[PDB]
Curated annotation (Swiss-Prot), chain B:
Essential for the formation of pili. Involved in the biogenesis of type 4 fimbriae probably by serving as a 'porthole' allowing passage of the fimbrae through the outer membrane. The lineage of its organism: Bacteria, Pseudomonadati, Pseudomonadota, Gammaproteobacteria, Pseudomonadales. It comes from the Bacteria. This is Fimbrial assembly protein PilQ. It is found in: Cell outer membrane. Belongs to the bacterial secretin family. PilQ subfamily.
Amino acid sequence: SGIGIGFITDNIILDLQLSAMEKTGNGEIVSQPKVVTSDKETAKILKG
Amino acid sequence: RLDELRRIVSQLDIPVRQVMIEARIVEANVGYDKSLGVRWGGAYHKGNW
């Protein structure tokens, strides 16, 4: 990904590189399940 | 007693009640995925990202 190459070869081969990586990842997941339940009773939505 | 029981019997002689239940499942999935690989390679001057 990130390589900065300085090369001499003709006079001498002298290689000087600054190799840097910056990675950015953002993941956002927003899920909303709605369940209709009796009162004081259990009801269950399961999505899997 | 016979008559009273008969009246209640009349109430009891009722057809079992059927109901047609129609519950429908609707699923919609929309998906977009994009990936970009940006690539600069030259070996003459040894520059390649």
